[PDB]
Amino acid sequence: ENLYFQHMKHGRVFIIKSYSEDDIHRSIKYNIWCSTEHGNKRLDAAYRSMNGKGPVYLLFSVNGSGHFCGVAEMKSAVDYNTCAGVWSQDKWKGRFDVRWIFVKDVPNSQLRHIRLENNENKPVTNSRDTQEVPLEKAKQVLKIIASYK
Numbered sequence: 174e175n176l177y178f179q180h181m182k183h184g185r186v187f188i189i190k191s192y193s194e195d196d197i198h199r200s201i202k203y204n205i206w207c208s209t210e211h212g213n214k215r216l217d218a219a220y221r222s223m224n225g226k227g228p229v230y231l232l233f234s235v236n237g238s239g240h241f242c243g244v245a246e247m248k249s250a251v252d253y254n255t256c257a258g259v260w261s262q263d264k265w266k267g268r269f270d271v272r273w274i275f276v277k278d279v280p281n282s283q284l285r286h287i288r289l290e291n292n293e294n295k296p297v298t299n300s301r302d303t304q305e306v307p308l309e310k311a312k313q314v315l316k317i318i319a320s321y322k
Contacts, residue, residue, distance in 0.1 A: 175320075178312040183227030185219045186311035190302035192236050193261035200245070201276060206231070207260050207267045212303035216269070217251040219305075231271065232306070232314060234281075234298075241279045241298075244318060245271040279321045287313050 189206070191197055200206050208216060220229050229247035234240065249270035257266045281298040287310055288294045297306065297314060306314065 175316065178316065181227075181312070182308075183223075184230065184308065184311075185223065185227075186230040186232060186306040186308065186314075187216060187219070188297070188300040188302065188304040188306065189231045189233045190236055190300065190304075191233065191261075194235050194238070196261045197233060197235060197242055199259070200233075200271060201243075201273050204245075204248070204271055204273065205268050206245070206247075206271045207265050207269070208303055209262075209265075210267070213251045213253070213267050213269075215303045215305075216247060220247050220250055220269075230274075230311065230315070232311075232318075239281055241281070241284065241318065243276040244274040244315070246274060248272050275318055277318070277321070279318050283317055283321055284314060287317075 223229055231245045231247060233242050235242060247269060251267055251269045253267045255266050255268045285296045285298045287297045289297055289306060289310060291307055292304060
């Protein structure tokens with residue numbers, strides 16, 4: 174029995190879909206991330222709305238990699254005016270702090286059977302960047318990622 178995520182009634186979870194393995198590596202090295210402008214605003218609102226009352230988790234996956242590659246917690250609001258050209262999209266300016274939790278590869282086949290009711294019942298593995306996960310589905314995804322060997 175692992176009932177750790179029971180009573181966790183606060184927290185929000187988003188899918189991060191990256192085109193670049195280099196961005197993932199930079200993120201792990203420096204504990205930062207940046208999304209599109211749309212994605213950043215979505216993450217920033219969730220972070221600011223949380224008021225430190227619980228975590229904002231990010232479930233990372235490189236497009237076409239066939240797997241998720243880990244989990245980080247969002248650790249600051251978005252700073253929208255930072256040095257350009259640090260990411261795979263050279264136009265991106267903007268940055269927020271993250272803290273990586275799991276760095277491990279989890280095949281999509283381990284997660285494909287969990288579906289998102291806010292995204293037309295599609296598999297969580299078919300999500301787009303900054304797709305939000307309902308908390309009840311996010312608990313199941315996290316337990317799977319933590320347990321995978």
